[PDB]
Ligand binder design. Structure first.
Ligand SMILES: Nc1ncnc2c1ncn2[C@@H]1O[C@H](COP(=O)(O)OP(=O)(O)O)[C@@H](O)[C@H]1O
Ligand SMILES: N#CCc1n[nH]c2cc(Br)c(Br)cc12
Ligand SMILES: [Mg+2]
Length: 327
């Protein structure tokens, strides 16, 4: 069957922490007072929650309330424990409270409010310097959560809030996050389609923190090349074909061979044969202001089929692409 894999960093962080840290099912939720929060307006509804802008009447501060749906109500302890474990970490959204919503009768997570800049506005206006600055800020959040034994598993632009006015970034939406345990087989139905790593698309379950580094690479490629999204698959199968049209099929087959993976036979008629394209193929007059040899080298080291071969968040922070960023 498939060959096992383990992370090259932070491998045993959960084995050396007390059971209380990662055993989220045994966690006893401390409930706050729902009357402290007055809902103001509905910001949206996802597959798992309804999100509202609210005011904390004990200090007149704005907050965001995520009211979980019954489907979500199952693995809520996992999101709660992860949020409490990471609380206070660099660029991690702060969970302010947990209350029982009187209408849904489900848990409602109360978060710090971010006066975030519109995501299309961010995509259209961030400069070369801004992209480097903000990529460094998201790497601080990812190295922190990885060092804490957690993988986010849903890195994408909408989960990376930026308040451009205060040069403030927060990594949000920890509902798909998981504790990393060496040898554990995880569900591959994580991350949004365009950000899914090759490990998920070929059904390799023994993945790790490096999944987040693929997703970050997808964000970087879209930003510097002005192509939203960078790998535009029509479904999860075509998603792999789009990746293979850029990275080539030979390295894909080497990756499948190394981990002894049985590729779904539905790929036999759609993958074809493709060479790796040099990153300069994607450069044009409308994106040249965001591309540099350092950006291309950094991107090249994130977007690798072999999850064990990708830069870790800490190695990424050492890259020359960030030398220009004021620290
Ligand atoms: N702390 C926050 N500050 C401001 N807006 C937020 C905050 N958290 C979520 N939002 C808003 O709510 C939505 C994202 O919610 P999210 O946690 O990603 O949902 P889900 O877990 O169902 O996928 C977006 O519309 C975003 O603008
Ligand atoms: N793509 C896009 C816009 C956007 N949303 N969130 C982000 C976080 C970062 Br880090 C960067 Br760069 C760009 C964005
Ligand atoms: Mg989200």
């Amino acid at each position: 069957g498939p060959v096992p894999s383990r992370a090259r960093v932070y491998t045993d962080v959960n084995t050396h922490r007390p059971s209380e840290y990662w055993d989220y099912e045994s966690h006893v939720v401390e409930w706050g007072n729902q009357d402290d929060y007055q809902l103001v307006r509905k910001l949206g509804r996802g597959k798992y929650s309804e999100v509202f802008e609210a005011i904390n009447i004990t200090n007149n501060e704005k907050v965001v309330v995520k009211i979980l749906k019954p489907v979500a109500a199952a693995k809520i302890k996992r999101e709660i424990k992860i949020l409490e474990n990471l609380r206070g970490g660099p660029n991690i959204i702060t969970l302010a409270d947990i209350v029982k919503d009187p209408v849904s009768r489900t848990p409602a997570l109360v978060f710090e409010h971010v006066n975030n800049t519109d995501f299309k506005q961010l995509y259209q206006t961030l400069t070369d310097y801004d992209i480097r600055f903000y990529m460094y800020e998201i790497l601080k959040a990812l190295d922190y959560c990885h060092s804490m034994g957690i993988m986010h598993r849903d890195v994408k632009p909408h989960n990376v809030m930026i308040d451009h006015e205060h040069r403030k970034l927060r990594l949000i939406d920890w509902g798909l996050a998981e504790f990393y345990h060496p040898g554990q087989e995880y569900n591959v139905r994580v991350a949004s389609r365009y950000f899914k790593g090759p490990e998920l698309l070929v059904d390799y379950q023994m993945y790790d923190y490096s999944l987040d580094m693929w997703s970050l690479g997808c964000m970087l490629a879209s930003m510097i090349f002005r192509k939203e999204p960078f790998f535009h698959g029509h479904d999860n199968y075509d998603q792999l074909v789009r990746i293979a049209k850029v990275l080539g099929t030979e390295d894909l087959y080497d990756y499948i061979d190394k981990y002894n993976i049985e590729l779904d036979p539905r790929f036999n008629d759609i993958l074809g044969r493709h060479s790796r394209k040099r990153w300069e193929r994607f450069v044009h007059s409308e994106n040249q202001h965001l591309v540099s040899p350092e950006a291309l080298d950094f991107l090249d080291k994130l977007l690798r089929y072999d999850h064990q071969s990708r830069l870790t968040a800490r190695e990424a922070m050492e890259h020359p692409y960030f030398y220009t960023v004021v620290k």
